[PDB]
Amino acid sequence: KEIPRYENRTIYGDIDFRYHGVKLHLRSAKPGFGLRVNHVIFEICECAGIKDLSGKVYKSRNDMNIAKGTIEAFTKAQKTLDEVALGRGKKLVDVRKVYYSS
Amino acid sequence: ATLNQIKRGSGPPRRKKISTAPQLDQCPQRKGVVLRVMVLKPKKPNSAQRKACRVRLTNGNVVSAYIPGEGHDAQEHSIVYVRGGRCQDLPGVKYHVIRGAGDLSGVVNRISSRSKYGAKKPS
């Protein structure tokens, strides 16, 4: 599956996702932050192309259910800026990106 | 719990390791006198003749200490130094005697891990 990536490095905002007994709390990170997450989540992020991420797993830490929950979270719990803008009829500006633009 | 119940004391239990050497009184080690040397039988599924010793510490606490290493010269009235650490297969033996301290000599002919058995370096 294709997963949305903000700047092809991280997720859009923060994610609090519940997959069966696994409570996933994932936070987006600044460029160069690296992957600071559960080891199962780390491997998935490497394959998916996520470079910067922070997170913590609560309740169940079953490897199998963390991996599936993570995949589900990356698809069902994210919304691109473009999708948010079109749905609300509003312009969303990345302030950090504009600051370094012409 | 509700917000008022938390205000009244409700909260997560704290996680902090508990003392497993209460008889030492929060000291690294305590001197003692061997009351009686004994041989004990491990709990199953282990089988051995584990050498232990009953010791009266300088604070009046009497404990059972495991004598590590192959062979020991500990007797009654021998001055021993006791440290923390239980013998897993021997129930009730929660302490260790230090080899090479007091009247307990270092393990004879010990080559590896000498510092753990009071053995000096061979020239």
Binding site: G13, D14, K79, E83, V84, G87, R88, L92 | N4
Partner: protein
């Protein structure tokens, strides 16, 4: 009433899950200001005054004779098989109200967790009440206002 606002936020979540195009909320000043902000921010398609039975087609003056039968009717938006208004939660709760100075509101919009409030996320709307007026947090920061952080909509 913050309780009424909590009821409305939960109601909108329930309606979004079933994908009803039109629903009603209690007729009060706070509810009207709350709905109006959502409408201007693009979370609601429509906002009409009405009765218990439906939105009014022609203007109906509200008086004590019919105040008990008044309702506000809001249209929910759905695009690409997803609800536009997915979640709606209070920050300031009835049993724990949160008043922040403008300095702390700027930290909240900058990624800093203030008083356990998770910071503003991309595309999220946080509303603040100041002197009985409801506005977006970014607008309160522009006006140098201190106010109660009411709710967050995403």
């Amino acid at each position: 009433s913050l309780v009424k606002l909590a009821n409305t936020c939960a109601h909108l979540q329930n309606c979004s899950k079933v994908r009803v195009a039109l629903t009603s909320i209690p007729y009060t000043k706070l509810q009207l200001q709350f709905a109006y902000n959502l409408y201007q921010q693009g979370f609601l398609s429509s906002l009409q005054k009405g009765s218990t039975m439906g939105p009014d087609k022609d203007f109906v003056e509200v008086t004590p004779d019919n105040i008990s039968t008044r309702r506000l009717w809001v249209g929910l938006k759905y695009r690409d098989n997803k609800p536009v208004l997915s979640s709606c939660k209070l920050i300031s709760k009835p049993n724990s109200r949160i008043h922040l100075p403008m300095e702390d509101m700027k930290k909240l919009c900058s990624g800093v967790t203030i008083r356990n409030i998770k910071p503003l996320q991309p595309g999220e709307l946080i509303l603040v009440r100041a002197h009985n007026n409801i506005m977006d947090i970014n607008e309160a920061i522009s006006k140098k206002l201190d106010g109660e952080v009411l709710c967050r909509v995403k």
